């Protein structure tokens, strides 16, 4: 499956797409990915579009 993360940071913006075999695994990956980017934000998920957002 494919999932997207929109990073809406104060000083960094991004869009990342991954392949994953599980929805919760994708969430866990993206949370670690944002943490590793130094991005600390609030989260959303939209199942219709397979899109996570993190907003600082
Ligand atoms: Zn699952
Ligand atoms: Zn789905």
Q: How far apart are the first and last CA of the chain?
A: 27
Give SS3 for 29: helix
Find the radius of gyration of the CA atoms of the chain: 10
Structure determined via:
X-ray
The answer to whether the beta carbons of residues 39 and 54 sit under 8 Å apart is yes
CATH says 1-56 is which class?
Answer: alpha beta
* Phi/psi of residue 13, nearest 5 degrees: -125, 150
The answer to whether the beta carbons of residues 53 and 14 sit under 8 Å apart is no
CA of 2 to the centre of ligand 2 (A): 9
The answer to whether the beta carbons of residues 15 and 4 sit under 8 Å apart is yes
> Which residues are within 8 A (CB) of 21 and not within 5 positions of it... i.e. 6 or more apart?
1
CA of 3 to the centre of ligand 2 (A): 9
CA of 28 to the centre of ligand 2 (A): 15
CA of 20 to the centre of ligand 2 (A): 11
Stated in angstroms to one decimal place, the resolution of this structure is 1.1
CA of 26 to the centre of ligand 1 (A): 9
């Amino acid at each position: 499956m494919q999932f997207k993360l929109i990073l809406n940071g104060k000083t960094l913006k991004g869009v990342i797409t991954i392949e994953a075999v599980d929805h919760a695994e994708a969430e866990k990956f993206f949370k670690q990915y944002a943490n590793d980017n130094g991005v600390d934000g609030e989260w959303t998920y939209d199942e219709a579009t397979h899109t996570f957002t993190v907003t600082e």
